[PDB]
Design a protein around this ligand. Structure first.
Ligand SMILES: [Mg+2]
Ligand SMILES: [Mg+2]
Ligand SMILES: [Mg+2]
Ligand SMILES: [Mg+2]
Ligand SMILES: [Mg+2]
Ligand SMILES: [Mg+2]
Ligand SMILES: [Mg+2]
Ligand SMILES: [Mg+2]
Ligand SMILES: [Mg+2]
Ligand SMILES: [Mg+2]
Ligand SMILES: [Mg+2]
Ligand SMILES: [Mg+2]
Ligand SMILES: [Mg+2]
Ligand SMILES: [Mg+2]
Ligand SMILES: [Mg+2]
Ligand SMILES: [Mg+2]
Ligand SMILES: [Mg+2]
Ligand SMILES: [Mg+2]
Ligand SMILES: [Mg+2]
Ligand SMILES: [Mg+2]
Ligand SMILES: [Mg+2]
Ligand SMILES: [Mg+2]
Ligand SMILES: [Mg+2]
Ligand SMILES: [Mg+2]
Ligand SMILES: [Mg+2]
Ligand SMILES: [Mg+2]
Ligand SMILES: [Mg+2]
Ligand SMILES: [Mg+2]
Ligand SMILES: [Mg+2]
Ligand SMILES: [Mg+2]
Ligand SMILES: [Mg+2]
Ligand SMILES: [Mg+2]
Ligand SMILES: [Mg+2]
Ligand SMILES: [Mg+2]
Ligand SMILES: [Mg+2]
Ligand SMILES: [Mg+2]
Ligand SMILES: [Mg+2]
Ligand SMILES: [Mg+2]
Ligand SMILES: [Mg+2]
Ligand SMILES: [Mg+2]
Lengths: 143, 64, 117, 201
RNA sequence: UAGCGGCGAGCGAACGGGGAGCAGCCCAGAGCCUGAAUCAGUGUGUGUGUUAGUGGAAGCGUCUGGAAAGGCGCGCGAUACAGGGUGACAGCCCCGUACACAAAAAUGCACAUGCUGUGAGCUCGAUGAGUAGGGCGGGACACGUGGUAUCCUGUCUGAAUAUGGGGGGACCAUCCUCCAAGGCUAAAUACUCCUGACUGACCGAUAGUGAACCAGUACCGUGAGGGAAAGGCGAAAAGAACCCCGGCGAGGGGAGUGAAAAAGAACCUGAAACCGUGUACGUACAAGCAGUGGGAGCACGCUUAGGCGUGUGACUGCGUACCUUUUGUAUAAUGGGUCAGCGACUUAUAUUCUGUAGCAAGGUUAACCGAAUAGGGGAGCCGAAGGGAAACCGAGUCUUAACU
């Protein structure tokens, strides 16, 4: 029987229709109020416009720059470190396992999660905690 | 279409770990001779955005 | 999916005009005038379901005053005597006794007087 | 799971997680609604205020006359052309998660098996494409309205009862939840059941 | 996103990755070698379309009915139950549909081949100057002259010639990579005046195209130009012979046709405002949003009630419309002559939150392919780690010579 399936309770609701009678609760002016710019079609002030007063994003100064090198430097999580699927942990091996990003030239091993495989790491910088974890798990780092 | 961020606010605010925003204090650009060293030292660090301004900051920065 | 209205709009107007029967002039012919007549009729009906109690109580009180003064006592003293007569519980609406059975009403008056005396 | 064969009174083994499990009514309802919306095409109409034949000339001057304020012959308020919120052709297809589709299908199959609307046989074909043969066989099997799915891709069977409305025949790969829920009873063929199991599961 | 920007409003890439599609060749010159490739333009042969077409299965009885296709009973076809018509809804009444066939004559698209023009390949050469670049003024590159690379040129100038020259975002050196100032080139891509078939949770005569109808018409304007209204008898005209009143009128009453004439041309259905005829009650000494509560009498259908219901409403208490805008409106503030029809919070794409469903440190695909709502595709995107302007460090990091 096809005419037997029904949606889960609370999964669907009608919503609201403005300007349909008094009983609906949104008649006449539908959630608009009386007069003013907030009413009317296409009304309302632009984004971040707090009146004619100088806005927050303009009364505060600028600072900093973009390194152009942080965008080419990833960090690998010590948790998995297994998607390499055998062999050593290399930059190209990480790229092959979709864990780093093709347009990446520097990676950090970091201490996050846990590792148990004794696989080694080559040509990657390792934090002190990550190094300790790898050596405890029986790995090796290409000093 | 995509929402276009306010580039003026993108270089004014930066997002923090718990969703807050950090910004640089004002009154530290010029005419600094008559300002107290205590005042300038307290202004030198960076502060967080207040409760009332978070709505405007988030509206300006949708992709931050 | 274009909705053509018509049938339901006619049904609502028919309902209102059916309720607006018996009214003079356009109040029973024109929907715009008739609709205002029905709402005012409802308002007046609501207010008078309340005013009815007051009107009938007033009529009963005047009635009891007339009968009690016929028997030789005012309404206030008659009510006070009935109240004091061993908390005798009788009724303002039951003042149809004063219309139908006169001897019963004078019997009531006799012990109202006795209680006051 | 064990499915009792019909033609040979034998038994066959199938995956429990596939052919038996709780029936997720909300999930199957979402998938069915999405499938129904998939067929729904657009092709709408109602040229709007701008693209209505006419002129930009103002019907009459702003002031000095007792008439209301008019600015265009194409106004939506006027008896002439003009529709406030016109309709453009649009797509109604939904996304439906890939795992959600398989889950809904598994639930449908489990419900069919549990309600005994699913039958399984070894072979099912007609030696000739005559509709009479298929009608006679279905009458003998007592199947007034049925969906038949196989993996053989038999053109003779396809031709037989090609337009017979109560009977539908389709390949094991072209199964859909709407057909599975619509047809009164479903008839499989050993090979088909394997192919589904190896797919759905 | 990087950037540009009265660094305001706003504008907005590229590198790189995944796909659709796959095609490379000539001149700046003659020696050989050859007439050789691959093309264009024309004949013939073969194949397949187009421009008329042919065949194309299977039902009877009975009831209601004006009429059977409907109900009841019993049969047959189906590679044909797409669709339309026929006196109400037909697989088997008709046209068709599935399927299988068909061209005298003229043409399209691919192949083979005859012939005309162009030519093949090898060695050796050559290698686009008022050009590149530059000064001045502009324009285009996401890039508004800014520290501004690169492209084009109105004006004035002006190189080198494989040992040479251009680029790599001011500029110099090293390195890498290409070879301007001569040309041609299919596919993937854009669109529909027009032709055929099919489709629609598109409209159904104030809708849909302006125009379902002899519509770009009537009509308006000197002209450019603007621009309507207007669909439906019945199955079949069987469209009312004949008689009567009437001006040998208009109009009507009979008769007749028809299932229906109250389907009669101004013809399906026939609502509302608005205007009439008849019946019941009230109304000519009574003052106002015309109702509402009480309520006599009168007139009509019933009852085991008489005083139950319906119509009217003498008399009587209370009672100054609606909407909008306002501190506040009976207000003498705005709007509405009335009826019918139409008429105003929508759609697309992004982003945040709530509910609900799937999956669970993972979730999910986009284009595209596809036996096309399946399956493949993980390019990507979000999350699991933050601090700092950044290098950088990292469950820590920043500040500071360093922090309790
Ligand atoms: Mg409210
Ligand atoms: Mg208003
Ligand atoms: Mg105001
Ligand atoms: Mg307001
Ligand atoms: Mg507007
Ligand atoms: Mg100002
Ligand atoms: Mg990736
Ligand atoms: Mg400074
Ligand atoms: Mg409709
Ligand atoms: Mg009436
Ligand atoms: Mg229109
Ligand atoms: Mg898919
Ligand atoms: Mg024929
Ligand atoms: Mg035939
Ligand atoms: Mg019959
Ligand atoms: Mg009929
Ligand atoms: Mg130049
Ligand atoms: Mg220059
Ligand atoms: Mg140059
Ligand atoms: Mg350069
Ligand atoms: Mg450089
Ligand atoms: Mg050159
Ligand atoms: Mg029209
Ligand atoms: Mg009509
Ligand atoms: Mg004229
Ligand atoms: Mg006549
Ligand atoms: Mg009809
Ligand atoms: Mg009529
Ligand atoms: Mg009428
Ligand atoms: Mg008098
Ligand atoms: Mg009188
Ligand atoms: Mg008067
Ligand atoms: Mg009064
Ligand atoms: Mg005022
Ligand atoms: Mg007042
Ligand atoms: Mg006043
Ligand atoms: Mg007024
Ligand atoms: Mg006004
Ligand atoms: Mg007025
Ligand atoms: Mg970080």
């Amino acid at each position: 029987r096809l005419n037997t399936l029904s949606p889960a309770e609370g999964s669907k609701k009608a919503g609201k229709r403005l300007g349909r009678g008094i009983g609906s609760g949104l008649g006449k002016t539908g959630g608009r109020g009386h007069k003013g710019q907030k009413s009317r079609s296409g009304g309302g002030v632009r984004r971040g416009f707090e009146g004619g007063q100088m806005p927050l994003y303009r009364r505060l100064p600028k600072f900093g720059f973009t390194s152009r090198k942080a965008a080419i430097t990833a960090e690998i999580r010590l948790s998995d470190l297994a998607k390499v699927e055998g062999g050593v942990v290399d930059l190209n091996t990480l790229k092959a396992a979709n864990i780093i990003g093709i347009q990446i030239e520097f990676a950090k091993v970091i201490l996050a999660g846990e590792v148990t495989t004794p696989v080694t790491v080559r040509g990657l910088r390792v934090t002190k905690g990550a190094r300790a974890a790898i050596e405890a798990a029986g790995g090796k780092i290409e000093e | 279409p995509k929402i276009k961020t306010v580039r003026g606010a993108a270089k004014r605010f930066k997002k923090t770990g718990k969703g807050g925003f950090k910004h640089k204090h004002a009154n530290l650009r010029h005419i600094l001779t008559k300002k107290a060293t205590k005042r300038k030292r307290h202004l030198r660090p960076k502060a967080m955005v207040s409760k009332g301004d978070l709505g405007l900051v988030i509206a300006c920065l949708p992709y931050a | 999916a274009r909705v053509k209205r018509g049938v339901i709009a006619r049904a609502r107007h028919k309902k209102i005009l059916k309720q607006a029967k018996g009214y003079y002039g356009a109040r029973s012919r024109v929907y715009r005038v008739a609709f205002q007549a029905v709402i005012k009729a409802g308002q007046y009906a609501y207010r008078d379901r309340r005013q009815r109690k007051r009107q009938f109580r007033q009529l009963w009180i005047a009635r009891i005053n007339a009968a009690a003064r016929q028997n030789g006592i005012s309404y206030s003293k008659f009510i006070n005597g009935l109240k004091k007569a061993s908390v005798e519980i009788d009724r303002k609406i039951l003042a149809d006794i004063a219309v139908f059975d006169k001897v019963a009403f004078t019997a009531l008056v006799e012990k109202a007087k006795a209680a006051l005396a | 799971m064990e499915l009792v064969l019909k033609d040979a009174q034998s038994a066959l083994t199938v995956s429990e997680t596939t052919f038996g499990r709780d029936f997720n009514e909300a999930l199957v309802h979402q998938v069915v609604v999405a499938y129904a919306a998939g067929a729904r095409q657009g092709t709408r109409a109602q040229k709007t205020r701008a693209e209505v034949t006419g002129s930009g000339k103002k019907p009459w001057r702003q002031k000095g006359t007792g008439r209301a304020r008019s600015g265009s012959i194409k106004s939506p308020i006027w008896r002439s052309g003009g529709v406030t919120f016109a309709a453009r052709p649009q797509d109604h297809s939904q996304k439906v998660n890939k795992k959600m589709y398989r889950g809904a299908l598994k639930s449908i199959l489990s419900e069919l098996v549990r309600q005994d609307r699913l039958i399984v046989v070894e072979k099912f074909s007609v030696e000739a494409p005559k509709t009479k043969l298929l009608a006679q066989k279905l009458k003998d099997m007592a199947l007034e309205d049925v969906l038949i799915i196989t993996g053989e891709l038999d053109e003779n069977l396809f031709l037989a009862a090609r337009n017979l409305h109560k009977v539908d025949v389709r390949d094991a790969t072209g199964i859909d939840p709407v057909s599975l829920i619509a047809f009164d009873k479903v008839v499989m063929t050993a090979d088909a059941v394997k192919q589904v199991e190896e797919m759905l599961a």
